[PDB]
Design a protein around this ligand. Structure first.
Ligand SMILES: *Cc1c(COP(=O)(O)O)cnc(C)c1O
Ligand SMILES: *Cc1c(COP(=O)(O)O)cnc(C)c1O
Lengths: 527, 527
């Protein structure tokens, strides 16, 4: 995606490394001649580029046609008439099946700015790049504005554990229209029970309510920083922690304790200076954290990365727990996808690790917007300044560590009621709800790999609880067009999910729709 | 509030100024003797403290009992038995009237961390410090878990323009339970019309949907930074722009272009280095912006500050518009409180100023969580990379300025429908809805000042459209306890609001409840 920003920052550190000038000083457009580089400096720079890229640029170019970083970036940024006639007639039958979605997207592109209108954009199939617009949904099905049914394995990006509009959720909304709901303004009469139930479900000691996962992450870091008096923070390459700037970064090349590089335009490097990216599940990284000792305010890990539902790095995490625990560093587990999905107690319970702060979201909102930060009082006390009682003469003891948090829509009266219902339902259903969801998901992946193995197809399915992804070398973007044409709705992020509402016939139509589609390009020349 | 952090940072710059050592180097606990300060350096430091504080500290203290910054801070941080017996019997009749709220707060303090359990905390009246818990609401009334009615002038912090549960909002939720709502996952079939209506209501060219005002602000800055290739940003002292860290700062003392100081523990100064606070409506500040020239990525102003609904700085803002416009700097107006409140077209329409980006929230969500960022394509193009069409061979032209934004709950299907209804209702009602709300609010404030003037009371009411505040030298915290005891619910932030649902009797009971209460401490010894 945002590659040129990454290429620019890579050279800006390669140059800075070989020459000695601080990178916050290297104009990206200045001609190379004026940096005054040695000939070994220039071969070393030529080498890092031959390594990290395919290209071998003759150093003469640096003095002629590629005389500044900007121009190296633009250069460094770089079909059978058999296959053509299959897709030419695909793009046809496709676009004709979803023409309403394309018309609605064309008609609202400008007035409604949304980065999802761009996903899987390519200059040559631009006649078929637009999101699918939905009109309705129920259980595991979804209907687009053309009328096409879908089996939904997107499930609101993981929100809808129980499918769309499960009966107990609908009745909660219906109940809220009759009962003259308390308003925003005064405090929730229901957040108390939601928290208690969460504490019982998960082991955490105190619980706080925000408006999204991004907000929950943002606030968690602020809590680790306020409690440790520290400022630096490690997160891991490939994790996803929301869109708060202070976590939107990339790994500074061959860096250990080295500040990170911005992910994309508009993220200023100032926001990166208290952030370190390290590789996940590689023993070197614990050493760097160990090396940092009493430096880190926090380590923030996505227990199981939504990108790699395979990497279930048990050993890493317990090791990660020991390290952070003796250095007084807060361990922050991001359970926004896995919490209340792998099991009622989350990743913390599945890996038998107890973190200092966790963040929840997605499922725990019942369909409504929600982000939560919860954990030990030692940090949570930064939110209110510590417990106290009436009748004694106590006081917020952490008053001088108390930070700033707020929010208009915190503990929203409807949202708190939808959460409350999710938890009651989950504590009413047994462990056996999760066992039946996981085992349903295992079946689907097993019986998919078994079809891939028996006919030698470059596709494998990966899994953690009910979260599963495809892994293949074939052109995914086009494969997933075929699924979505085949009535199996998969958003562009390709995080797939099953719900308790997915039946036998849904589990079938999925395994089938991909069987027919591997047969659809086999017979199109994409084996 | 977070004063010790501000005192510490003040000295850390006073010391650094007089001595020359960079403040990011001054250990806050090191003994003063070791900084090696001259005797004029030490008198100059003694002077800045006598100025900015009341205290005159003899320099000997710096070498004995106050030998480090930490100890200066703790020191620098510094009742008739007639009055006592009134409040002693108040705290009584109060707590007895709201004992359910106090019991619920005690019972959930620890399990539910929430900074609002602390507001108006004081060690001596700690027997009466807890939020009011609400059970119900309708129109302009709200009921606590004890049963006490209230006239609500909080109105969800400005959310409920039309009161609690106006009929057209309820019927929207009711409609959504029957109709098998489309899900999160695929894109909204309704966001297109919401945006168009907003464009027609407000003048903006493109519109984007997030999850809170904090998110909307956060994303707006990211857009100004991505479009201008710049990173520094000015915001103004006393504004409120959400809880995104990169705006949580305070004015570095006597600074113009100087980076700001963190607001509170846990905000690292790295986040402050691309942020400048300046005084609002003071001609010096436009000069500093002028001086910065092509430096600023953005200026972010709260058109009318929710703290000072008086300061309606017409002249400042148009001047602010000219400046930012010729330097290619994005002007960002934060209309989260004033948008769709002063009038359908917001502060932009009331002051006849057209900004580059605006943020909306609160009201525009219909009761549901929502934050919006909208403005000229020149910046909004950073969200999707620019319009394009089918049938031609166009392309996202701003592709290399495109930043990163996301969000699970963006354009939530219910929320988009509640927004859609707000706008239809607002475009169905005339300008005359706003004229009748404003004129209703003017009456209430006029007839309040007229009662204050005729009996010489240190209280004045301030106003912008339907937003009004109290301004008084008497102890507000206790005054507002009396109102809330008097059945007039005012949250701790004291931003007050009228709704279209406030009747003649509500407008009366308010003017009255404060009349009786000024008479309640007149007869208690607080004139
Ligand atoms: C989705 C997700 C987030 C962001 O959640 P929002 O509700 O979109 O802010 C953060 N962390 C993880 C691990 C996620 O899966
Ligand atoms: C309330 C408010 C915000 C923050 O809104 P949230 O919805 O609580 O994030 C930001 N700016 C202004 C001017 C506000 O009044």
């Amino acid at each position: 995606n945002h590659t040129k920003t990454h290429i620019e920052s890579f050279l800006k550190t390669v140059i800075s490394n070989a020459s000695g000038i601080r990178a916050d000083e290297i104009d990206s457009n200045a001609h190379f001649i004026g940096f005054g580089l040695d000939s070994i400096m220039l071969t070393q720079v030529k080498k890092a580029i031959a390594d990290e890229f395919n290209v071998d640029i003759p150093m003469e170019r640096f003095f002629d046609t590629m005389n500044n970083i900007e121009s190296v970036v633009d250069y460094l940024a770089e079909y059978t008439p058999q296959q053509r006639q299959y897709l030419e007639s695909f793009i046809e039958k496709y676009v004709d099946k979803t023409k309403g979605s394309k018309q609605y997207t064309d008609e609202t592109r400008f007035a409604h700015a949304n980065n999802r209108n761009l996903s899987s954009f390519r200059s040559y199939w631009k006649e078929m790049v637009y999101p699918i617009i939905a009109e309705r949904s129920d259980g595991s099905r979804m209907w687009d504005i053309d009328g096409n049914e879908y089996i939904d394995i997107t499930m609101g990006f993981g929100v809808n554990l129980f499918g769309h509009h499960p009966s107990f959720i609908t009745q909660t909304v219906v109940d809220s229209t009759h009962s003259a709901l308390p308003p925003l303004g005064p405090m929730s009469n229901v957040a108390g029970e939601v928290a208690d139930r969460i504490r019982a479900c998960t082991g955490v000691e105190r619980v706080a309510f925000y408006n999204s996962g991004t907000e929950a992450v943002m606030v968690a870091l602020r809590l680790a920083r306020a409690a440790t008096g520290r400022t630096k923070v490690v997160v891991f390459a490939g994790s996803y922690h929301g869109t708060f700037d202070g976590v939107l970064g990339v790994a500074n090349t061959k860096g250990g304790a080295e500040p990170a590089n911005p992910l994309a335009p508009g993220i200023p490097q100032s926001f990166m200076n208290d952030l370190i990216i390290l590789h996940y599940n590689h023993p070197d990284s614990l050493d760097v954290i160990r090396n940092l000792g009493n430096e880190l305010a926090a380590v923030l890990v996505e227990p199981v990365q939504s990108r790699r539902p395979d990497l279930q790095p048990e050993s890493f995490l317990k090791e990660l727990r020991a390290i952070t625990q003796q250095s007084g560093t807060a361990l922050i587990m991001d359970e926004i996808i896995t919490g209340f999905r792998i099991g009622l107690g989350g990743a913390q319970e599945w890996f038998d690790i107890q973190a200092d702060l966790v963040t929840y979201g997605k499922i725990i909102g019942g369909g409504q917007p929600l982000g939560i930060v919860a954990g030990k009082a030692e940090f949570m006390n930064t939110i209110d300044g510590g417990t106290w009682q009436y009748g004694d003469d106590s006081y917020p003891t952490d008053e001088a560590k108390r930070t700033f948090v707020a929010g208009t829509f915190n503990t929203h009266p409807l949202t708190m009621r939808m959460s409350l219902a999710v938890l009651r339902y989950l504590q009413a259903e047994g462990e056996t709800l999760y066992e039946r969801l996981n085992q349903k998901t295992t079946y689907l992946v097993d019986q998919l790999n078994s079809y891939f193995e028996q006919s030698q197809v470059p596709i494998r399915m990966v899994q953690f609880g009910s979260l599963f992804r495809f892994v293949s070398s074939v052109d995914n973007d086009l494969f997933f067009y075929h699924l979505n044409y085949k009535g199996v709705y998969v958003w562009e992020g390709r995080n797939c999910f099953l719900s308790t509402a997915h039946t036998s016939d849904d589990i079938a139509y999925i395994i089938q729709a991909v069987q027919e589609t591997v047969k659809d390009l086999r017979r199109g020349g994409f084996i």
